[PDB]
Symmetry: D2
Subunit: 254 residues, 4 copies
Amino acid sequence: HATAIVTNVKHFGGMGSALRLSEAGHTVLCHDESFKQKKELEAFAETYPQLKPMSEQEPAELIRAVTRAYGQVDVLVSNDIFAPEFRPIDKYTVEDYRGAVEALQIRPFALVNAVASQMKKRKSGHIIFITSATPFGPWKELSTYTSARAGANTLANVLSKELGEYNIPVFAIGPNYLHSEDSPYFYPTTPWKTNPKHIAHVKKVTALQRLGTQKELGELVAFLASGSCDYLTGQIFWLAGGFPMIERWPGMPE
Amino acid sequence: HATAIVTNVKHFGGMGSALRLSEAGHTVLCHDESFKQKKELEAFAETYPQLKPMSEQEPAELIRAVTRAYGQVDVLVSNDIFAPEFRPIDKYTVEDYRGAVEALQIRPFALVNAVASQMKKRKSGHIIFITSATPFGPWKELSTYTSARAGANTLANVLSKELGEYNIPVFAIGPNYLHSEDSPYFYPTTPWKTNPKHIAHVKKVTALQRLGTQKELGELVAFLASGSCDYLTGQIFWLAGGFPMIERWPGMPE
Amino acid sequence: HATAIVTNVKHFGGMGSALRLSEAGHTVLCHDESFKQKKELEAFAETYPQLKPMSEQEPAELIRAVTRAYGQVDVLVSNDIFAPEFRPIDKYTVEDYRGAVEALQIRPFALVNAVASQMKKRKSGHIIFITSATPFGPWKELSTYTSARAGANTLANVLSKELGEYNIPVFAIGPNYLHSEDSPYFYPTTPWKTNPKHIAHVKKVTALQRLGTQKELGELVAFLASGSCDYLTGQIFWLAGGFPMIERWPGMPE
Amino acid sequence: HATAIVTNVKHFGGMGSALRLSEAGHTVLCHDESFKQKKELEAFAETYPQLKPMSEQEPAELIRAVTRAYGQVDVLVSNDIFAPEFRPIDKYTVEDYRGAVEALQIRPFALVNAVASQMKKRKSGHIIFITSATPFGPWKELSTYTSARAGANTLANVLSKELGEYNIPVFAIGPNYLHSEDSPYFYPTTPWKTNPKHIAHVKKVTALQRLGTQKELGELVAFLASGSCDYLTGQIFWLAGGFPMIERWPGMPE
Ligand SMILES: [Cl-]
Ligand SMILES: [Cl-]
Ligand SMILES: [Cl-]
Ligand SMILES: [Cl-]
Ligand SMILES: [Cl-]
Ligand SMILES: [Cl-]
Ligand SMILES: [Cl-]
Ligand SMILES: [Cl-]
Ligand SMILES: [Cl-]
Ligand SMILES: [Cl-]
Ligand code: NA
Ligand code: NA
Ligand code: NA
Ligand code: NA
């Protein structure tokens, strides 16, 4: 069976991806910061017997471990996370930007850098970055997070050009307003399904007037990873329910 | 079962769409200019017993006929076609542009204009335009066709904003280098799989170094129409295998 | 001296363009629908002695008349207008879309189709379309106007590819929230500087928290027409003060 | 008088920017890595008496020194450079990507982080990044450089949203094929005007069939810095002569 790595599986698009990839018949190797602790890894493995958590934390280490134990990495889902911190540009430190770039650009780069050679040698593989739709509709005072996510989107697009010759599609999925259940990355049930202000905000700024679901994200990840539509390689997908809705002139209804 | 209209079914993305939608369990009502002739309609119906060709040619007429005979239109695939004519801007006539706009913008607009009310009333439906990736990577001297296709892409994106409130996703799929078998719209087997110059051109300008397949287009259409990933509403998909490849500096290999 | 045509001079970007081009030393030939009436044309010529209003209305006749009287057309500013009419997609007629594409796509196409040969023969000229920033940040229920403007933007970008061989730059300037003085196209003094609701809306949705000025538009038109920065050819300029501002999460200041 | 900082003045868009800003009446404070050597700084000051070279290298020290000596920083031109190194993704090291993001994203971020407070306090200033058009038309095997430049472009666009409230426009100018005279960043006279292969390549891939000039870049920088067209804030300018030209089908002329 085909192998798939999902990183930061407890957060963002991790569970939607891992669960739907597993249902599609992949062996899903799952990374997470919490899996440094045996108790957390074992608890996850018991709750999700169809998933295979690994303890390895860093990119080369993780790729090498999965390759040793399962033969090869057929699918990489780089589910990258970093807390958005809103500040006026002069109130950040430079290290605040470096941290965002490290988590949101250097990390997916390092994973591809470690796995690309084995994919190129057999001329097969799929690479998916989960990034952000914030560059499409940016908020004021989120300059660090948003620009790093744009770097990752362009990284995916550029990589598609060189890896296409080796039959390796590369995609970026950029969500916004994706319900993240009990993860703070980025729309947890509380407040986003519980507080009237937040419920009204989502109804206002998305065309579909709701949060996106983990199932929708997982369906897209599994579809791309299936090899059924490789000709989309290089695509940045905006998975944001039609966000942004743009405020209309006075006198028009919402 | 859910109904799906595919227009110009003999051409462009028509057969990939109709066949994969049918496999997914839709009743697929098929439009085509050739179905004005009973012999052509009956021959198609015999060759493809899982498809239902209609004789109706024009938008309101077609929507009304399918609604009368099958109850409702759940999915619209506006597979729009017009021959690309390359000319210096001053060598066209103004009517050359009007013809492109009529075929590539007014036609999908007219179809949505005719079907939107029934979708809005029941708060369900999916709309897919098959357009072109030419606006993403334009060729010189194709100003009429390319700009009309961009109008259609923007039409899809804008429509997603108003129809989202009614739970109707709207998408545009913009192909290039899609193999179109025995249709001249736009990459027929001859010359594109038979002539060495054409084979070499496709290898040069696409990242995956091949034509796209009807199966890949059909997989995307059926995935979007399935209701499995509505949160992509408003997306323009570039289905062009990583086109364009951009020419590199002297001294670098191809 | 160098000649420039500015169309619909009384509206949208017309006076900013005409007045700044004249100050930069162009002979500015002005079109306007009101110039069908001799009295209107003569009142304009008396108020603006540095401008030269023409009575011609149709693109071919206008280009021919300017060429006959002033030798050549060095700069074309296609300042296109159409009344934005907001409707749900099913409440338009198809003719409502044809009217929008005729005014916003066919017309700039016809003007370039009529003037390009003379510019190509001498290998000099500049072409500027004034379009819209609505495709960048679309409002719901403006599907006709917005998609036609996107067609015009792509037309300019595609035209740049063929005309660059002849040393003719082509640009599109897409405004939003440009103050238009007494013209209803699209942000007249009343209500946009006089009604508190409109004043508040402009402050909220633009980054600079004000309307754009005719002077700003004219400075950009004159700069591009000057031959000082031809290497921008093909650019779509968003002249919208940093619109759109995107609504932020609850808890964050405006 | 108004002050402007131009970084890496000997390279890329540095001299075009500095020389045209000076001609427009700015006091132009010039940074360059070579100005670590007193002899280099003094030779520059003697050749260009209208320019003021500074020895400071680090962003905070440079802004502080200009502010101390000349009162304030009115215009920042962050003319960022890094050597483009083409490699397959697996042949880079991770540090190769960190170097690119440090030079092309962290550095402009640090300069704005150091200068923004003084501009905000007085509600005036202009910020221009010189980036790259490579994200618009990416070459294969340049994943580090190209994705870092896209990060910088998005940084400028996001910054425009918060700084517009303070009347500070932010722009990114993304060049390609800009003639850079004796600088190797990125199109020096030799080989790009002297080697037939390079001459042919520029003719093929740009619409205007030539390199861009330092004067064209400087005209755009001075125009944006002038305060004449602030309503363009947030714009990414592609200063690439209509690049990329996209290869056409067999049978069509070049
Ligand atoms: Cl490691
Ligand atoms: Cl999200
Ligand atoms: Cl009809
Ligand atoms: Cl195609
Ligand atoms: Cl006339
Ligand atoms: Cl406007
Ligand atoms: Cl004004
Ligand atoms: Cl220093
Ligand atoms: Cl350059
Ligand atoms: Cl030069
Ligand atoms: Na372990
Ligand atoms: Na019939
Ligand atoms: Na007359
Ligand atoms: Na010093």
